[PDB]
Design an enzyme around this catalytic site. Structure first.
Site, PDB file in Angstrom:
ATOM      1  N   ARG A 248       0.857  -1.309   0.128  1.00 54.60           N
ATOM      2  CA  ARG A 248      -0.163  -0.160  -0.062  1.00 54.60           C
ATOM      3  C   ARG A 248       0.571   1.223   0.362  1.00 54.60           C
ATOM      4  O   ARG A 248       1.535   0.682   0.551  1.00 54.60           O
ATOM      5  CB  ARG A 248      -0.877  -0.176   1.031  1.00 54.60           C
ATOM      6  CG  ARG A 248      -1.997  -1.027   1.230  1.00 54.60           C
ATOM      7  CD  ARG A 248      -2.427  -0.833   2.731  1.00 54.60           C
ATOM      8  NE  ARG A 248      -2.037  -1.798   3.631  1.00 54.60           N
ATOM      9  CZ  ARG A 248      -2.130  -1.830   4.847  1.00 54.60           C
ATOM     10  NH1 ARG A 248      -3.252  -2.560   5.001  1.00 54.60           N
ATOM     11  NH2 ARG A 248      -1.102  -2.443   5.524  1.00 54.60           N
ATOM     12  N   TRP A 257      -0.896   9.856  10.429  1.00 51.44           N
ATOM     13  CA  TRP A 257      -0.718   9.027  12.480  1.00 51.44           C
ATOM     14  C   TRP A 257       0.509   9.896  12.819  1.00 51.44           C
ATOM     15  O   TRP A 257      -0.126   9.892  14.202  1.00 51.44           O
ATOM     16  CB  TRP A 257      -0.087   7.606  11.400  1.00 51.44           C
ATOM     17  CG  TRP A 257      -0.808   6.523  12.274  1.00 51.44           C
ATOM     18  CD1 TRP A 257      -1.297   6.826  13.069  1.00 51.44           C
ATOM     19  CD2 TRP A 257      -2.414   6.104  11.942  1.00 51.44           C
ATOM     20  NE1 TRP A 257      -1.570   5.285  14.275  1.00 51.44           N
ATOM     21  CE2 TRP A 257      -2.873   5.557  12.976  1.00 51.44           C
ATOM     22  CE3 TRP A 257      -3.285   6.779  10.424  1.00 51.44           C
ATOM     23  CZ2 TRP A 257      -4.463   4.423  13.014  1.00 51.44           C
ATOM     24  CZ3 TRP A 257      -4.503   5.833  10.611  1.00 51.44           C
ATOM     25  CH2 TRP A 257      -4.464   4.253  11.708  1.00 51.44           C
ATOM     26  N   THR A 385       0.469  -7.580  16.961  1.00 51.03           N
ATOM     27  CA  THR A 385       0.039  -6.927  15.071  1.00 51.03           C
ATOM     28  C   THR A 385      -0.328  -5.815  15.030  1.00 51.03           C
ATOM     29  O   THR A 385      -0.557  -5.844  13.550  1.00 51.03           O
ATOM     30  CB  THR A 385      -0.727  -8.209  14.868  1.00 51.03           C
ATOM     31  OG1 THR A 385      -1.681  -8.546  15.211  1.00 51.03           O
ATOM     32  CG2 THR A 385       0.727  -9.166  14.874  1.00 51.03           C
ATOM     33  N   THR A 386      -1.058  -5.133  16.106  1.00 50.55           N
ATOM     34  CA  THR A 386      -1.695  -4.145  16.211  1.00 50.55           C
ATOM     35  C   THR A 386      -0.648  -2.883  15.760  1.00 50.55           C
ATOM     36  O   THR A 386      -0.591  -1.444  14.883  1.00 50.55           O
ATOM     37  CB  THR A 386      -2.131  -3.119  17.227  1.00 50.55           C
ATOM     38  OG1 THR A 386      -1.442  -2.978  18.122  1.00 50.55           O
ATOM     39  CG2 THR A 386      -3.161  -4.497  17.594  1.00 50.55           C
ATOM     40  N   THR A 387       0.751  -2.944  15.675  1.00 47.92           N
ATOM     41  CA  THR A 387       1.365  -2.143  16.606  1.00 47.92           C
ATOM     42  C   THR A 387       2.229  -1.515  17.329  1.00 47.92           C
ATOM     43  O   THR A 387       3.365  -0.612  16.950  1.00 47.92           O
ATOM     44  CB  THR A 387       2.450  -1.891  14.093  1.00 47.92           C
ATOM     45  OG1 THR A 387       1.804  -1.056  13.902  1.00 47.92           O
ATOM     46  CG2 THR A 387       2.007  -3.324  13.693  1.00 47.92           C
ATOM     47  N   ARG A 425      -6.742  -2.573  18.792  1.00 50.83           N
ATOM     48  CA  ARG A 425      -7.421  -4.286  18.274  1.00 50.83           C
ATOM     49  C   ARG A 425      -8.682  -4.339  18.701  1.00 50.83           C
ATOM     50  O   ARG A 425      -9.228  -4.571  17.384  1.00 50.83           O
ATOM     51  CB  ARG A 425      -6.990  -5.226  19.328  1.00 50.83           C
ATOM     52  CG  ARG A 425      -7.176  -6.498  18.972  1.00 50.83           C
ATOM     53  CD  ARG A 425      -5.790  -7.161  18.006  1.00 50.83           C
ATOM     54  NE  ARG A 425      -6.294  -6.610  17.005  1.00 50.83           N
ATOM     55  CZ  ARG A 425      -5.608  -6.738  15.926  1.00 50.83           C
ATOM     56  NH1 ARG A 425      -4.398  -7.079  15.426  1.00 50.83           N
ATOM     57  NH2 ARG A 425      -5.965  -6.516  14.474  1.00 50.83           N
ATOM     58  N   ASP A 428     -10.399  -2.299  15.452  1.00 47.89           N
ATOM     59  CA  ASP A 428      -9.855  -3.144  14.476  1.00 47.89           C
ATOM     60  C   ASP A 428     -10.979  -4.497  14.011  1.00 47.89           C
ATOM     61  O   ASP A 428     -11.049  -3.941  12.757  1.00 47.89           O
ATOM     62  CB  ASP A 428      -8.160  -3.231  14.261  1.00 47.89           C
ATOM     63  CG  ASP A 428      -8.098  -4.002  12.587  1.00 47.89           C
ATOM     64  OD1 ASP A 428      -7.888  -5.084  12.298  1.00 47.89           O
ATOM     65  OD2 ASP A 428      -7.284  -2.934  11.813  1.00 47.89           O
ATOM     66  N   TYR A 504     -11.699   5.124  12.473  1.00 53.05           N
ATOM     67  CA  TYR A 504     -11.781   3.520  12.446  1.00 53.05           C
ATOM     68  C   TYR A 504     -13.725   4.302  12.783  1.00 53.05           C
ATOM     69  O   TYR A 504     -14.730   3.662  13.224  1.00 53.05           O
ATOM     70  CB  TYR A 504     -12.320   2.733  13.290  1.00 53.05           C
ATOM     71  CG  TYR A 504     -10.813   1.930  12.856  1.00 53.05           C
ATOM     72  CD1 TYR A 504      -9.846   2.178  12.675  1.00 53.05           C
ATOM     73  CD2 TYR A 504     -11.353   1.022  12.148  1.00 53.05           C
ATOM     74  CE1 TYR A 504      -8.464   1.852  12.232  1.00 53.05           C
ATOM     75  CE2 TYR A 504      -9.760  -0.003  11.300  1.00 53.05           C
ATOM     76  CZ  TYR A 504      -8.761   0.224  11.742  1.00 53.05           C
ATOM     77  OH  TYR A 504      -7.680   0.004  11.346  1.00 53.05           O
ATOM     78  N   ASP A 509     -11.861   0.817   8.285  1.00 52.55           N
ATOM     79  CA  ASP A 509     -10.628   0.466   7.645  1.00 52.55           C
ATOM     80  C   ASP A 509     -10.105   2.395   7.780  1.00 52.55           C
ATOM     81  O   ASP A 509      -9.779   2.123   5.978  1.00 52.55           O
ATOM     82  CB  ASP A 509      -9.993  -0.373   6.801  1.00 52.55           C
ATOM     83  CG  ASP A 509      -7.946  -0.937   7.073  1.00 52.55           C
ATOM     84  OD1 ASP A 509      -7.526   0.592   8.135  1.00 52.55           O
ATOM     85  OD2 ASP A 509      -7.473  -1.782   6.887  1.00 52.55           O
ATOM     86  N   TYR A 511      -7.316   3.860   7.365  1.00 54.53           N
ATOM     87  CA  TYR A 511      -5.691   4.016   6.613  1.00 54.53           C
ATOM     88  C   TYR A 511      -5.670   2.592   5.150  1.00 54.53           C
ATOM     89  O   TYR A 511      -5.233   3.535   3.666  1.00 54.53           O
ATOM     90  CB  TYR A 511      -4.580   3.247   7.408  1.00 54.53           C
ATOM     91  CG  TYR A 511      -3.489   2.391   6.790  1.00 54.53           C
ATOM     92  CD1 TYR A 511      -2.404   1.811   6.080  1.00 54.53           C
ATOM     93  CD2 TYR A 511      -2.514   4.118   7.363  1.00 54.53           C
ATOM     94  CE1 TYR A 511      -1.620   2.190   5.474  1.00 54.53           C
ATOM     95  CE2 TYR A 511      -1.803   4.005   6.900  1.00 54.53           C
ATOM     96  CZ  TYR A 511      -0.754   2.605   5.973  1.00 54.53           C
ATOM     97  OH  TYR A 511       0.446   3.150   5.766  1.00 54.53           O
TER      98      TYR A 511
HETATM   99  C1  LIG Z   1      -4.445  -0.591   8.247  1.00 52.67           C
HETATM  100  C2  LIG Z   1      -3.562   0.293   8.580  1.00 52.67           C
HETATM  101  C3  LIG Z   1      -1.915  -0.574   8.277  1.00 52.67           C
HETATM  102  C4  LIG Z   1      -2.886   1.418   8.980  1.00 52.67           C
HETATM  103  C5  LIG Z   1      -1.559   1.592  10.196  1.00 52.67           C
HETATM  104  C6  LIG Z   1      -2.267   2.183  11.943  1.00 52.67           C
HETATM  105  C7  LIG Z   1      -2.850   0.463  12.591  1.00 52.67           C
HETATM  106  C8  LIG Z   1      -2.376   0.964  13.475  1.00 52.67           C
HETATM  107  C9  LIG Z   1      -3.788   0.468  12.633  1.00 52.67           C
HETATM  108  C10 LIG Z   1      -4.635  -0.302  13.381  1.00 52.67           C
HETATM  109  C11 LIG Z   1      -4.204  -1.535  13.435  1.00 52.67           C
HETATM  110  C12 LIG Z   1      -3.696  -2.721  11.758  1.00 52.67           C
HETATM  111  C13 LIG Z   1      -1.898  -1.918  11.758  1.00 52.67           C
HETATM  112  C14 LIG Z   1      -3.866  -3.281  11.242  1.00 52.67           C
HETATM  113  C15 LIG Z   1      -3.692  -3.758   9.749  1.00 52.67           C
HETATM  114  O1  LIG Z   1      -3.309  -3.029   8.819  1.00 52.67           O
HETATM  115  P1  LIG Z   1      -4.236  -5.943  10.047  1.00 52.67           P
HETATM  116  O2  LIG Z   1      -5.738  -5.631  10.372  1.00 52.67           O
HETATM  117  O3  LIG Z   1      -4.273  -6.089   8.273  1.00 52.67           O
HETATM  118  O4  LIG Z   1      -3.073  -6.733  10.696  1.00 52.67           O
HETATM  119 MG   LIG Z   2      -7.995  -7.358  12.111  1.00 51.93          MG
HETATM  120 MG   LIG Z   3      -3.319  -5.592   6.557  1.00 50.35          MG
END
Ligand SMILES: CC(C)=CCC/C(C)=C/CC/C(C)=C/[C@H](O)P(=O)(O)O
Ligand SMILES: [Mg+2]
Ligand SMILES: [Mg+2]
Ligand SMILES: [Mg+2]
Length: 532
Positions: A248, A257, A385-387, A425, A428, A504, A509, A511
């Site tokens: 992307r 962000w 995984t939300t980073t 989390r 999302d 959100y 989504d 992003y």
């Molecule tokens: C859509 C994205 C990358 C936004 C970047 C910022 C971010 C923290 C969003 C929420 C968590 C993520 C990382 C969703 C992933 O994309 P997924 O559900 O695909 O793991």
């Molecule tokens: Mg998800």
């Molecule tokens: Mg993804």
């Protein structure tokens, strides 16, 4: 297959030449308006209501970052005096402002507005200014504030009922509040809306404050524009748009962000570093999700863990590009911090990156096996995984005041950080449930929750919502003094939680799909300047 929509923007940001003449002009007048506004705060015989309103206005205008000391001492004095300005409007505002600043003011101040049953007097339903401030205050409550359990539902139903017949700009301020509260919203976004849509149209507006607000916002915007241009060039010098077409292209969105985490000019280096990281990890996410195979991903995950360029040969050509860019980015970070002697802290961001990747691998493994783990297990992996642990650690990199002890505190996964991650989390998962289920990803939150508790989709989402609410009360408690670390280091975490809520907002989504949510924000923050 491909699927992802291309960047809405284009080369619209590569170019930005700051007209140094206009910048200096703005800076010069701002300094004058700055001390005028400082003198306003230092006024002696002002009433409580007037003082709270001044502080509230300066904050909403986005210029409060100039008076962190002045504002603190005033609120500190207000906290220790415990003066009973008896009306709902002043009380609710007094509560919110103090709480947002760490002052643990007792919620029993709301007793005089409730009957003997503990509920709000329905007679206050005709006080709009009171209902509004109560609505805003209801979002800053902790677990020890059950006295405000019905405050949100109370103020909301009465604000919706009165809204249609109010005079402007009050009508718009209320309508906006019901769609987005101040506390859980992004600072720049709320400031942009207040300055242009509300204060400028306010009949009783203070011209000196309005002028100050407009100039400051526009001046900082020039800096944001410069930063975004620098990151756009850096992003093109990589050309992942053509070499890695599966990913992307959301470098602008990643800047938004980083801008949501902090906008102050002093966080210039920090924002830049953070944008590069979000953009980079977005690719790694895109690789595990819509490209790499079980074998390739396993080789990639292992390569990351080793963190050595020698392991590049085990990775296929396309992954070699990603892998090298990542190590070099961190070598650049080490180089940027070499001056101050803060290079020794880059490792913290790296250890978190490896963690994110491990979980990315586990996530794909579960997808392949068709594994639907119990909520307990799901979260132990899905939280990273939300980073957010990663991004939060990253935000400290450019912050010149961040010490080793700060990273040490953050590594132990504090409740405030834990709470921020949960919100990201849960939100999302509630938004992306259906879409991810269609792609076969049966390892998603709502699904795990459904089969683990034996409940419907509705109940699963409803329970997740409660997890976010709890997380918010936990974030609110983290801000209360004495804070484990300086407030300067808690705000980024708070802001990270704010950005998800805002992205959100329409339960989509933002992003991956910017146009409906992020586009307007980016235009109002990075394109269009507030017209004076
Ligand atoms: C859509 C994205 C990358 C936004 C970047 C910022 C971010 C923290 C969003 C929420 C968590 C993520 C990382 C969703 C992933 O994309 P997924 O559900 O695909 O793991
Ligand atoms: Mg998800
Ligand atoms: Mg993804
Ligand atoms: Mg992923």
């Amino acid at each position: 297959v491909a699927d992802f929509s291309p960047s809405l923007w284009g080369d619209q940001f590569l170019s930005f030449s700051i007209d140094n003449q206009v910048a200096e002009k703005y800076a010069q007048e701002i300094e004058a308006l700055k001390e005028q506004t400082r003198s306003m705060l230092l006024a002696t015989g002002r009433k409580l209501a007037d003082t709270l309103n001044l502080i509230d206005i300066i904050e909403r205008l986005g210029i409060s970052y100039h008076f962190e000391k002045e504002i603190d001492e005033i609120l500190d004095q207000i906290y220790n005096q415990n003066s009973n300005c008896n009306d709902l409007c002043t009380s609710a505002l007094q509560f919110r402002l103090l709480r947002q600043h760490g002052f643990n003011i007792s919620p029993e101040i709301f007793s005089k507005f409730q009957d003997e049953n503990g509920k709000f007097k329905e007679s206050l339903a005709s006080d709009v200014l009171g209902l509004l401030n109560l609505y805003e205050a209801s979002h800053v409550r902790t677990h020890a504030d059950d006295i405000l359990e019905d405050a949100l539902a109370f103020s909301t139903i009465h604000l919706e009922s009165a809204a249609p017949h109010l005079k402007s700009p009050l009508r718009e301020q209320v309508t906006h509040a019901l769609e987005q509260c101040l506390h859980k919203g992004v600072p720049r976004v709320e400031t942009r809306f207040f300055i242009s849509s509300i204060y400028d149209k306010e009949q009783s507006k203070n011209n000196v404050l309005l002028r100050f607000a407009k100039l400051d916002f526009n001046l900082l915007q020039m800096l944001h524009k410069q930063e975004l241009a620098q990151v756009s060039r850096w992003w093109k010098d990589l050309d992942f748009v053509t070499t890695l077409p599966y990913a992307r292209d959301r470098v602008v969105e990643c800047y938004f962000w980083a801008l949501g985490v902090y906008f102050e000019p002093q966080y210039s280096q920090a924002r830049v570093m953070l944008v590069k990281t979000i953009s980079m990890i977005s690719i790694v996410d895109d690789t595990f999700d819509a490209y790499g195979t079980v074998k390739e991903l396993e080789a990639y995950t292992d390569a990351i863990q080793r963190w050595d360029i020698n392991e590049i040969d085990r990775l296929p050509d396309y992954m070699k590009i990603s892998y090298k860019a990542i190590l070099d980015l961190y070598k650049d970070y080490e180089k940027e911090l070499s001056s101050a002697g803060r290079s020794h802290i880059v490792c913290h961001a790296i250890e978190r990156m490896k963690e994110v990747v491990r979980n990315y691998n586990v996530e794909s493994t579960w997808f392949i096996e068709g594994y639907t783990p119990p909520v307990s297990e799901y979260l132990s992996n899905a939280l990273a995984t939300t980073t957010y642990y990663y991004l939060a650690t990253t935000s400290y990199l450019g912050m010149k005041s961040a010490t080793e002890q700060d990273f040490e505190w953050l590594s132990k996964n504090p409740k405030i950080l834990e709470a921020s991650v949960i919100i990201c989390r849960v939100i999302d998962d509630t938004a992306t449930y259906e879409v991810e289920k269609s792609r076969g990803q049966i390892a998603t939150g709502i699904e795990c929750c459904m089969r683990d508790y034996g409940i419907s989709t509705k109940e699963a989402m409803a329970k997740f919502q409660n997890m976010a609410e709890t997380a918010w009360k936990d974030i609110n408690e983290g801000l209360l003094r004495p804070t484990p670390v300086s407030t300067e280091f808690l705000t980024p975490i708070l802001n990270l939680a704010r950005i998800v809520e805002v992205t959100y907002i329409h339960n989509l989504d933002g992003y991956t799909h910017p146009e409906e949510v992020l586009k307007p924000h980016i235009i109002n923050l990075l394109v269009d300047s507030i017209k004076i």
